[PDB]
Amino acid sequence: GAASTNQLQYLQKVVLKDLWKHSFSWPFQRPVDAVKLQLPDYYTIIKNPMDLNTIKKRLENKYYAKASECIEDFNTMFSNCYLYNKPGDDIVLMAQALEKLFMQKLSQMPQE
Ligand SMILES: CC[C@@H]1C(=O)N(C)c2cnc(Nc3ccc(C(=O)NC4CCN(C)CC4)cc3OC)nc2N1C1CCCC1
Ligand SMILES: [Cl-]
Structure with a gap:
């Protein structure tokens, strides 16, 4: 398909998949459960929550019109x-390692 189709396909089939497979992805695989984690202030502070499963579902559901929208969510x-x-904090070190992988996969984003 067109470049834009290949870009969103790449984000789903390669970028999301490889981040998910990374050993540090587990905190990011579901929305933050504020009660379970004992963090009453989380959704007071974070007004645009995001996680990999939400991104996964959005890609599956063809929610994004273009790759930049999906990249914004990551x-x-x-x-x-x-x-x-x-x-x-350990969670920040984990995020940084995942982001490094994300940036590496983005550097190979096709542009055709
Ligand atoms: C939301 C803040 C931050 C973040 O940004 N994200 C993304 C996050 C995503 N997921 C998690 N996951 C879990 C974190 C803690 C626990 C856990 O079992 N906490 C116990 C709760 C009861 N208490 C008595 C003892 C500790 C389970 C988790 O996943 C099942 N933590 C995250 N952190 C961490 C939250 C505490 C430090 C930072
Ligand atoms: Cl699910």
């Missing part, structure tokens, strides 16, 4: 983690 997921947590 970046939001990482930014939320940096904003909510503190420097040096």
Whole structure:
């Protein structure tokens, strides 16, 4: 298909899949459960929550019109983690490692 089709296909079949398979993806595989995690303030602080399963469903459901919209959701997921947590926290180190992988896969995004 067209470049834009290949881009969203790449985000689903390669980028999302490889991030999910990474050993540090588990905190990012579901929405934050504020009661379970004992964090009453999470959704007061984070007003545009995002996670990999939401992104997965959106790609499956053909929700994104173009790749940039999907990339915005991945970046939001990482930014939320940096904003909510503190420097040096384990969850931040995990996010940073995942983001490094994300950036590597993006650097090979097709443009045709
Ligand atoms: C939401 C804040 C931040 C973040 O940004 N994301 C994305 C996140 C996504 N997922 C998780 N996952 C879990 C984190 C903690 C637990 C857990 O079992 N917490 C116990 C709760 C009861 N308490 C007595 C002892 C600790 C389970 C998790 O997943 C099932 N944590 C996340 N953190 C962490 C939240 C605490 C540090 C940072
Ligand atoms: Cl599900």
